[PDB]
Amino acid sequence: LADCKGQINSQLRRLRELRAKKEEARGKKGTIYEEE
Amino acid sequence: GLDSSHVGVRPSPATSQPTTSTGSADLDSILGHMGLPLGNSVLVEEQSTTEFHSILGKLFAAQGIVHNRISDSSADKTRNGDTHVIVLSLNQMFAKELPGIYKGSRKQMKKNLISEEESKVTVQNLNETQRSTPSRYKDLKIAWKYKLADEKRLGSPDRDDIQQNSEYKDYNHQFDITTRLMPAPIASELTFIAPTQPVSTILSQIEQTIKRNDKKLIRIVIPSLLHPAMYPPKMFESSEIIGLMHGVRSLVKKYYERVVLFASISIDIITPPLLVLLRNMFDSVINLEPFNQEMTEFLERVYKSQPGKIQHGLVHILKLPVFTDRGEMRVLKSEWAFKNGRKKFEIEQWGIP
Amino acid sequence: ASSSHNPVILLKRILSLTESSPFILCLDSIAQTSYKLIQEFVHQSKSKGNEYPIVYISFETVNKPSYCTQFIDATQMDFVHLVKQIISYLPAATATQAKKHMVIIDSLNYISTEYITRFLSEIASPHCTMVATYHKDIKDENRTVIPDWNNNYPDKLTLLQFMATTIVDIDVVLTGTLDTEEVSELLNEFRIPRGLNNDIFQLRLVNKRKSGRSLEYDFIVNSNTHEYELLS
C-alpha cells in the first residue's frame, strides 16, 4: 500500500505536459521522442 | 631541467624515457607510448566540417590543470604536477569550459535483473538507485600496457593504492560531459596568446612565457589554427607560418624534457601544397573521417538496438614519434572507429559495419 | 526529433524566418537567374507578417525593387561606409532585446575577397539576416593578388561555403529538347538557345546543424502558385 501510494504520487507529479509538441503515418502526428 | 618524480616521467616500452599521457586511453594506446615522449608534436586532424577536435583539445589542458590542482602530500612526498598551459589563440572564452574530474557510478551492477519501473522503485522520471542509461562497460583508468596491437595484460584491476608502481597506472583521472573542472585558473596555469599580432611579437612572447618557469613542465595547445573566422589574409603567406612552425620546432627540440606541442585544425578548405609542406614540420600526424548520411543507415542497421555502441567515424594515422624515423613504415588509414557519444571517447577495431 | 518532421515544413520555416539563421547563401548562374527566390521570401515571409525593413543593398541593379521597402546604391561607397550606412536601417548590435529585419544583396561578385570575412564580422548580430546570391559563371580578378608561390590564401568559393549555415543551389529544369551537355557547350560559345530561364526551377538544399552532420535534399519549386515538391 505504501508502494502504491508512492507510485501514484510520483506518477501524478511528473506530468509536465510535453510543451514541445513539434513546436512551441507512423506516429500519426510525429510526437514520440520520450512520449507514449 | 625538470626534476624527477613528475606525474608523467613514466618510462616507455622502447626508450624508457618520459612520456606524459594524452589523457584518453585509446589516444595513449594508439600513439604507441602511453602518450608521447617529450619534445615531439602531434597533429590530430578533422577533414570535414565536424568539430570533434574541439573536445580533446580541451582535456589535454584540463588534465594538466588536474596535476596543477593536486599539490597536497603524496604517499610521503609532495608530488610535482605543475604544467603551465599556453594557448596561441585570442579566445579567452574557451578557458571557462573544461570538463572536470569524473566521480560517481559509471556502470550498472544490479543485484537482481535489470528491469523497468515496477521492479525496484518508481517511474524512472526519478531514476533508480544505482545506475541508469544502460551502458555496460565504461573506460575508467590508465595503464602502461594498454597499447593496441601490443602484448597481453591490457587491464588495470581498478587498484586503489598509491605506490611507486602507481606512477605507471591507476592514478590518471577520467572525465565526462557534464563534469566541470572548477574554478577557472589564473595566470599561474593558463596563458593566452593573440594570434593576429605579427609573428615577430608572438615568437618573443612565447619565448618569455616558457622561459620564466625553470624546472616546470610546459604544455602548448592550439584549439584552432589559421582559420578565416579569426585570422587575417596577411598571415596566410607561405613564409610567416612556416617560419613560426620552424621556430616552434627548434624550441621544442631544445627543451625535450619540459615542453610539448599539440595542435589540430580542419583541412577541408586547405590547399594541399601548404598542407603537406607543413605536415613535414612536426613528428606525428593523425586524421579523422566522420561518417556521413549515406552510411548512418547501415550504422544503425548493424548497431541496431544499442544505446552506447554507436560510432562516429574512422581514424587515420600517418606519423608517430621518433621510432618511425628509423626506416619503419607505420601509416594506417581507416581501420579503427572512434566514438564520442555521451560517455567514454573510445576506439574500436573494425572497418565499415 | 520531434521538430520539422517533413522537409517541406523545414523549408517553409526557413523561408518565413520562423527559425533564425545567421547566414544563408544561394547559388545561381546564367542558365537561371536568382530573383525569383526574393519573390519567394516576400510571399512566404508575409504569412507570418514580416513587414520589417527589407533593405535592398545593390551593386549593379539599375531598377528599384517594388517588393522591398528600401533601396541603397553602393557604387560610390567604400567598405567602412558601406557597413556604416546599413547599421541605421538594420537593427544594429544594440538593444539586446529587439526585432529583426531583412537584407537583400543583389550581387557578391563585385567585392574583393580580402574583406569578405570582415563584412560578416562587423554586422553579424542576432538581429540581422544576410541574404545574397553568388553567380558562378564570373571568374574574379586575380592580377592584384598576384598568386605567386609565396602569396597564397584560399579562394572565394571555399570561404563562402564555409561561413554559411544554410546553402541553396538553383537550377533550371530542362523541359524541351535541350540536355546538359549541349546546353553547357552552347553557353561556352554563347548561342543561348531556346529553353532557358523559366519560372519553374529546381533547388538543392544543404542545412547545417550544430554538433552534427548537415542534411542534403532536393526540391522542385514553382514561381507561379508558390508551391513545392520534394525530390521523390
Curated annotation (Swiss-Prot), chain A:
The chain holds residues 1158 to 1253 of 1349 of the full protein. Phosphorylation promotes the tRNA modification function of the elongator complex. Signal peptide: none annotated. It comes from the Eukaryota. Homodimer; dimerization promotes ELP1/IKI3 stability and elongator complex formation. Component of the elongator complex which consists of ELP1/IKI3, ELP2, ELP3, ELP4, ELP5/IKI1 and ELP6. The elongator complex is composed of two copies of the Elp123 subcomplex (composed of ELP1/IKI3, ELP2 and ELP3) and two copies of the Elp456 subcomplex (composed of ELP4, ELP5/IKI1 and ELP6). The Elp123 subcomplex forms a two-lobed scaffold, which binds the Elp456 subcomplex asymmetrically. In the complex, ELP1/IKI3 interacts with ELP2. In each lobe, ELP2 is tightly sandwiched between ELP1/IKI3 and ELP3. It comes from Saccharomyces cerevisiae (strain ATCC 204508 / S288c). Disruption phenotype: Loss of mcm5U (5-methoxycarbonylmethyl uridine) and ncm5U (5-carbamoylmethyl uridine) from tRNA. The gene is IKI3. Component of the elongator complex which is required for multiple tRNA modifications, including mcm5U (5-methoxycarbonylmethyl uridine), mcm5s2U (5-methoxycarbonylmethyl-2-thiouridine), and ncm5U (5-carbamoylmethyl uridine). The elongator complex catalyzes formation of carboxymethyluridine in the wobble base at position 34 in tRNAs. Functions as a gamma-toxin target (TOT); disruption of the complex confers resistance to Kluyveromyces lactis toxin zymocin (pGKL1 killer toxin). May also be involved in sensitivity to Pichia inositovora toxin. This is Elongator complex protein 1. Belongs to the ELP1/IKA1 family. It is found in: Cytoplasm; Nucleus. Present with 10500 molecules/cell in log phase SD medium.
UniProtKB/Swiss-Prot annotation, chain B:
Belongs to the ELP4 family. Pathway: tRNA modification; 5-methoxycarbonylmethyl-2-thiouridine-tRNA biosynthesis. Residues 11-24 have a biased composition (Low complexity). Its main location: cytoplasm. Keywords: Cytoplasm, Methylation, Nucleus, Phosphoprotein, tRNA processing. It comes from Saccharomyces cerevisiae (strain ATCC 204508 / S288c). The modification Phosphoserine is found at S156. The chain holds residues 67 to 419 of 456 of the full protein. The lineage of its organism: Eukaryota, Fungi, Dikarya, Ascomycota, Saccharomycotina. It comes from the Eukaryota. The gene is ELP4. Component of the elongator complex, a multiprotein complex which is required for multiple tRNA modifications, including mcm5U (5-methoxycarbonylmethyl uridine), mcm5s2U (5-methoxycarbonylmethyl-2-thiouridine), and ncm5U (5-carbamoylmethyl uridine). The elongator complex catalyzes formation of carboxymethyluridine in the wobble base at position 34 in tRNAs. It functions as a gamma-toxin target (TOT); disruption of the complex confers resistance to Kluyveromyces lactis toxin zymocin (pGKL1 killer toxin). May also be involved in sensitivity to Pichia inositovora toxin. Present with 358 molecules/cell in log phase SD medium. This is Elongator complex protein 4. Component of the elongator complex which consists of ELP1/IKI3, ELP2, ELP3, ELP4, ELP5/IKI1 and ELP6. The elongator complex is composed of two copies of the Elp123 subcomplex (composed of ELP1/IKI3, ELP2 and ELP3) and two copies of the Elp456 subcomplex (composed of ELP4, ELP5/IKI1 and ELP6). The Elp123 subcomplex forms a two-lobed scaffold, which binds the Elp456 subcomplex asymmetrically. In each lobe, ELP2 is tightly sandwiched between ELP1/IKI3 and ELP3. The Elp123 subcomplex binds tRNA through ELP1/IKI3 and ELP3 and can bind 2 tRNAs simultaneously. GO terms for molecular function: identical protein binding.
Curated annotation (Swiss-Prot), chain C:
The chain holds residues 2 to 233 of 309 of the full protein. This is Elongator complex protein 5. The keyword Hydrolase does not apply. The lineage of its organism: Eukaryota, Fungi, Dikarya, Ascomycota, Saccharomycotina. GO terms for biological process: regulation of translation; tRNA modification; tRNA wobble uridine modification. Component of the elongator complex, which consists of ELP1/IKI3, ELP2, ELP3, ELP4, ELP5/IKI1 and ELP6. The elongator complex is composed of two copies of the Elp123 subcomplex (composed of ELP1/IKI3, ELP2 and ELP3) and two copies of the Elp456 subcomplex (composed of ELP4, ELP5/IKI1 and ELP6). The Elp123 subcomplex forms a two-lobed scaffold, which binds the Elp456 subcomplex asymmetrically. In each lobe, ELP2 is tightly sandwiched between ELP1/IKI3 and ELP3. The Elp123 subcomplex binds tRNA through ELP1/IKI3 and ELP3 and can bind 2 tRNAs simultaneously. The keyword Cell membrane does not apply. Present with 3870 molecules/cell in log phase SD medium. Pathway: tRNA modification; 5-methoxycarbonylmethyl-2-thiouridine-tRNA biosynthesis.
